[PDB]
Amino acid sequence: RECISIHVGQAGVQIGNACWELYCLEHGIQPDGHVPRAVFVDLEPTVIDEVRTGTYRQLFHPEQLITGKEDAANNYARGHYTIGKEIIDLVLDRIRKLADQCTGLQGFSVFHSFGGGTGSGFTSLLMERLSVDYGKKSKLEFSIYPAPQVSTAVVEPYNSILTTHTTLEHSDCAFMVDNEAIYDICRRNLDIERPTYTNLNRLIGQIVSSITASLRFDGALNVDLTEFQTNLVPYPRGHFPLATYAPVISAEKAYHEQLSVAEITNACFEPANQMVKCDPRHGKYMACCLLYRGDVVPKDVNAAIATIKTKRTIQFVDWCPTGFKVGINYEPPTVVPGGDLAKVQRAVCMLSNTTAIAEAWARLDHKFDLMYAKRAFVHWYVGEGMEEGEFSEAREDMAALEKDYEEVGVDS
């Protein structure tokens, strides 16, 4: 029934504070109500301290807030091996203490930021130790993969080719939200050249609410978490659908709000609205889980999708007749009281596996090689209990992820 969550890395914790904010906000549970159902991990105290100092302060137990006062380090190795090791036991202990207290759970919604130190490396082993301790569950990891041109860390690809290879054999379904391709939504679909990180987090904080929150909530067409990985992954690679939201309208500027289903659904497949710089440049969809919420007639959907199934410029995979999981919820979305989000009475949080990430992975893999080709910042991981092995042998890993996402599509 339930789904724990493990917000790892500063960013996975900032997004975590935001997804966690939107929750109580649509459940009538002010600052001090019930009890959360998650944990927070970081090797930099000052960030989890922002959850201990700032808003939502007493909504957590100091027991679901793990910190390693030591050092974060923007390197996978250190955060996986060397340092992040010391904390893992303690970390696990909470996702085994919080996993026991419940009643027949379904999995752990992991929140991490691919190209970090604590977000790449640590989670790599956290998810690692989970796939063994609870191989009988769901492991849906919600990632914030590397911006396509606007990366931060100098090494980013080293950290994100290493979180992918280690988690790949361990996740069930990896949601992906690209940090930069969200900013385009903040520029183009909301109008603001002032997007604080606090906003991208409200936005993932929205799409995510559509995933767990409202879907684990009753509705006219409920969709369990297992339902996702079933209806969403064609193959055992921990396949990485993309998140998209529909009524991303501005709560100030334009106002057509009343944008019946027939519109909000078409607004998902336009590439300028998908929280991912994986514009459907060729990538055939292979399965989409259209989660609706609010006032939606099942015929409006079983027609608004029918129109789409016959657009053909949306080309689905060959071996897939029908790849449209319609999930209908009741309660409309719930916007921040005065952020910048419109506030409609219906939305579409469509997510999907697309052959499109054949790109995004390629462009992120090629990055890695350019630096590994010169060893760049290699001495920073080797000196942290890694080897020429784990790099070169995690490169070969994703190589068969460029071929996998090529073979499962492009061919008939």
Partner: protein
């Protein structure tokens, strides 16, 4: 996390008074007084530089290493001079002779054990140590000789904790000493092989940046030092604040050193406007990157326009959009694709604190690892050979128990260090 500053020599000392003059106001610490802090955030992280004893007396956790009494006796007899616990003053009333050999082998070598004693009292303070800040000049006895020894010992006691070095590399045009390249070539040698982050500052690169970028007509030393101390506060202490994307000495190290030599950077501050008039507030952000990435405004002597970058770290500290930050950095990376090296897809390390330098709206420290600093260790290494050939003032070194092979060693090492840095300019 924590650090323990080190005031080696007079210059590194004189600067210590300016580094601590600043930082303390950036932390509301009056002379012996406590946290008057205008806020409450300038205190949750102070531990990085201080210690709890009384309850109003957070003492700076530095070391004052000098063979010349009158110096530390000017820093201790002036303004904030009465905040250092007397235990910090590791004096050497000996002759502080201007010889690198006199402060590294003969006269400094005695005072060292009475230093290491305290560097351990302060490291074993509490919590977890990060590293040590080191200030000094590469142009004197107590600076380049004794201060380079202090580190060669520190890096044997804690090869885990980092080592930032703030060196006052010998300024080109005029040398404020004569043997200068001797004291220098010999300390850079030790630096390339112990510290792992160096921030080289030039008394004349400052004068320029302080007489034309501040219309300041009478740039006293107190000013140069003040400007420098403004950067080393945007580096360390700063990132020991919150931020949308914070780093810390390691992130700065682990993003900025592609190759283990250590590599030396070139710091640059952001809002560098003359007082009254120029308070243009053209600080939206494109104005800070405009600033930091120009030639002039690099506290180094060399001009970045003369050589690629390997890494950059714009350590901003002032509320700004993670879009207009992460964006600007890009166009900067593409307008100047020429000088930025290519085998690093993203040279730049964007870093973003929240709280800005007390009285300002928005700043950003710049920490450039350009290959342009090749054209300085060249300079130093030249001045060496031109005089080493004739053994100029060498009898002051050998006559202090030195070696004719020791000078050879350092020059060649630091001269190879030039070579290597070119391997990436190409």
């Amino acid at each position: 996390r924590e650090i323990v500053h080190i005031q080696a020599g007079q210059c590194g000392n004189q600067i210590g008074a300016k580094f601590w003059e600043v930082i303390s106001d950036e932390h509301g610490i009056d002379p012996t007084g406590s946290y008057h802090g205008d806020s409450d955030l300038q205190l949750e992280r102070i531990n990085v530089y201080y210690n709890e004893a009384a309850g109003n007396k957070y003492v700076p956790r530095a070391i004052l290493v000098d063979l010349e009494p009158g110096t530390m006796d000017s820093v201790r007899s002036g303004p904030f001079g009465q905040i250092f616990r007397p235990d910090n003053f590791v004096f050497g009333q000996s002759g502080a002779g201007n010889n690198w050999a006199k402060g590294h082998y003969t006269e400094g070598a005695e005072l060292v054990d009475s230093v290491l004693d305290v560097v351990r009292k302060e490291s074993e303070s509490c919590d977890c140590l990060q590293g040590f800040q080191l200030t000094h000049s590469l142009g004197g006895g107590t600076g380049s000789g004794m201060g380079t020894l202090l580190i060669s010992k520190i890096r044997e006691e804690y090869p885990d904790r980092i080592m930032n070095t703030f060196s006052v590399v010998p300024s080109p045009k005029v040398s404020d000493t004569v043997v200068e390249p001797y004291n220098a070539t010999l300390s850079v040698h030790q630096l390339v092989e112990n510290t792992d982050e160096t921030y080289c500052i030039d008394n004349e690169a400052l004068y320029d940046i302080c007489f034309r970028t501040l219309k300041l007509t009478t740039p006293t030393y107190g000013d140069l030092n003040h400007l420098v101390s403004a950067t080393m506060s945007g580096v360390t202490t700063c990132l020991r604040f919150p931020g949308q994307l914070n780093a810390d000495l390691r992130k700065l190290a682990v993003n900025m050193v592609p190759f283990p030599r250590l590599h030396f950077f070139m710091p640059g501050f952001a809002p560098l406007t003359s007082r009254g008039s120029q308070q243009y507030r053209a600080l939206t952000v494109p104005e800070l990157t405009q600033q930091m990435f120009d030639a002039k405004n690099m506290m180094a002597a060399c001009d970045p326009r003369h050589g690629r970058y390997l890494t950059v770290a714009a350590v901003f500290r002032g509320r700004m959009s993670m879009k207009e930050v992460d964006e600007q950095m890009l166009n900067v990376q593409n307008k100047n694709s020429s000088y930025f090296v290519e085998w690093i897809p993203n040279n730049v390390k964007t870093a973003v604190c929240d709280i800005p330098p007390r009285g300002l709206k928005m700043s950003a420290t710049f920490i450039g690892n350009s290959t342009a600093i090749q054209e300085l260790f060249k300079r130093i290494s030249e001045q060496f050979t031109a005089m080493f050939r004739r053994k100029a003032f060498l009898h002051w070194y050998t006559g202090e128990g030195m070696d004719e092979m020791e000078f050879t060693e350092a020059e060649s090492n630091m001269n190879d260090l030039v070579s290597e840095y070119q391997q990436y300019q190409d």
